[PDB]
Structures are given as C-alpha cells and as structure tokens.
Amino acid sequence: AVPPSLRLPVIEAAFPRQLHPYWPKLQETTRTWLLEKRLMPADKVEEYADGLCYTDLMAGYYLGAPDEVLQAIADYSAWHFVWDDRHDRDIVHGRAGAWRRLRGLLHTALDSPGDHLHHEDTLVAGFADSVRRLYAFLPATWNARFARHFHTVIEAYDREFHNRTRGIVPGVEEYLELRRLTFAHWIWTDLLEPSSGCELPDAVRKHPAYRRAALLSQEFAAWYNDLCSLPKEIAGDEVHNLGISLITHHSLTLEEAIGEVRRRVEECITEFLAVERDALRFADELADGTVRGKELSGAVRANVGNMRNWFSSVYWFHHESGRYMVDSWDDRSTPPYVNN
Ligand SMILES: CC[N+](CC)(CC)Cc1ccccc1
Ligand SMILES: O=P([O-])([O-])O
Ligand SMILES: [Mg+2]
Ligand SMILES: [Mg+2]
Ligand SMILES: [Mg+2]
C-alpha cells in the first residue's frame, strides 16, 4: 500500500518486480560482511540490517548476475549506504578534517585497493575489499572506467560537504547535474557489464539509445529517492533534494514541489519506454549471425532489461526499507541505524 503522493500506477502495472535466485543467501552473506568488516555496530546490524533491504535492492536490479558478482555488488552497495551515513555524520558534527582524510583515502584506495584492505578506518578497509573484488571480473579497461567514475563521485560528495557546511542549497540545474554524481548514476551503469559478463565496446555502450536508456533509469531512481527521502531529509537538515531546490529557489510550496518532482519522475518512465524500444532494436541489429554479435546482443538486452528492473526495485525498496521510515523514529533528525 504505497501512499498516494508516492504511488506510481505505471510502475506497479507495467514494471513487474524481479528477484535474483541468490537473494536468500545474499541477504545473509552481506549481513555477515557488514559485521565482520565492522561497518556497523553489531547491535544495529542485528536490529536494522535486514530491515534496511539493501540486498533486496540489488537482487531486484542485477538479474542474471553470477552469484559472486552479485555478492560483490551487494557488499559494495551496502558499503555505499554506510558511507552516505558517515558522510552525513561528519557534516552534522563539523568534522571537516576527518572527512577530508576519508575523502583522500577513498581516492587512493580506488586506484590501489589491495594496499587498503586492513586500514584502521573500517570504512576504508571495507571499501577496498568490495572494490578489489569488483576489479576481478572484467579487463583492466573496465576497472579504469569504474575508477574514473568513482573519483568523480567522491568529489561530488565533497561538494555536498561544502554546500551543507556553508548552508547552500544548490540551484535546480546545479542540483540536477550534481545528482548524477552523488546518486552514482555511472557506477550502477558500469556494474551492468560484469553482471552480464561482458565489457561493452564504447561504440555499443555510447549508442544514443543505450546512453539515454541508462540515463533515464538513473534519473528516475535518483528523483524518486528524492521524492521518498524528502521527509527524513528535511528532518535531518539535508539540503540535496530536487524538492528542496525547488522550494528554496523557485518559491514553490511543499505540495507544489512534490507535484513537480512527481511529474519529472513520471516523465522518465514514459521516455524510458520509448528509448527502451530503440535500445532493443539496436540489440537486434547487433545479432548479425556471428558469435560476437550474438554475445553483444545478449549483453545489451540483459543490460537494458536491468535498467528496466531498476525502476521496480527502487520503487518497492523505498516502500519496504527501514531507511526512510522517519515517522517510526524516536528522533526524526537522527535515524536509528546511523552511528552518531
Ligand atoms: C545513499 C544511497 N545510494 C546508494 C548507496 C547512494 C548512491 C543511493 C540510492 C538510494 C536509494 C535507492 C537506490 C540508491
Ligand atoms: O564516462 P563515459 O566513458 O563517457 O561513459
Ligand atoms: Mg547522499
Ligand atoms: Mg543520504
Ligand atoms: Mg535521498
């Protein structure tokens, strides 16, 4: 029962949700990883980890992924949620120095994860572990692309630190550009490829239909998160949210802003449906009677399929995850699962 202001009938009707068969073991294994990597307090893992639905989110996304690939992705993704929490806490505590140091360590670990597997900062060591494993699936050219994209993500998180420390709410267009980095659009897009077991040639993944399908999948996800995470974000003095940018700089009321975000979210869906058709047509063109062509076709098809799955996985994640249930918290400004 999704609340009216959050409900999207098109997703519920035309985007049936999927579940990777490895999910039952995935949920257990990632939880054990969080504990052993000491990324969250043991009591908070016990009480909140399963209810956070982080593994569910990934298992509803990267369908067809080899089990060990899904495991590395799930561990990374859970880590990223914890990083977002650490980032938030450093901000509210004014820990500029601690953040700067972490920021610098993540950059270095990104290029040389093996060196950071046992760093004193458990967050850094956990990052390096998931990254080292992700670097073991595809050629070095894919690893370099992943690294390049993530360096940009880290710097986007630093810009967020800058903004919140100074009390700046980004303009609408400024936010939209920034959001493609803080949501890590291109990381999720990169991870499509190890999931289907094929590093795509540039001419394939930069095909206008593949590019646009990939973009719309991520825009929907980020903006829908903005819609659903808005209550807890307002309560927690978060400034990064399309709704917040609209209220601040466009003189919109909360109701009007929510409506504007909804419309932009809804447009992603129908625009995706159009481009999805073009992307699948491209997939057909790739199937040229050669083994290589069959391979590229199957990969693009699997990838576009997962771009579609992201819609439904993200939609239901926000309904199920304990991460956004601010009304159930003792202190609305302080989520119970974060280390304060
Ligand atoms: C902060 C959480 N996350 C993923 C770890 C960072 C990019 C974005 C996200 C939120 C909600 C659903 C999906 C992704
Ligand atoms: O980053 P990119 O390679 O363009 O995707
Ligand atoms: Mg964030
Ligand atoms: Mg956040
Ligand atoms: Mg959010």
From Swiss-Prot:
Mg(2+) 1 binds at D84, D88. It is an enzyme of class 4 (lyase). CDD domains: Terpene_cyclase_nonplant_C1. Binds 3 Mg(2+) ions per subunit. Can also use Mn(2+) and Fe(3+) but less efficiently, and other divalent cations such as Zn(2+), Fe(2+), Co(2+), Cu(2+) and Ni(2+) are nearly completely inefficient as cofactors. The keyword Secreted does not apply. Its EC number is 4.2.3.37. Pathway: Sesquiterpene biosynthesis; epi-isozizaene biosynthesis. It comes from the Bacteria. Mg(2+) 2 binds at D84, D88. Keywords: Lyase, Magnesium, Metal-binding. The Asp-Asp-Xaa-Xaa-Asp/Glu (DDXXD/E) motif is important for the catalytic activity, presumably through binding to Mg(2+). Catalyzes the cyclization of farnesyl diphosphate (FPP) to the sesquiterpene epi-isozizaene. This is Epi-isozizaene synthase.
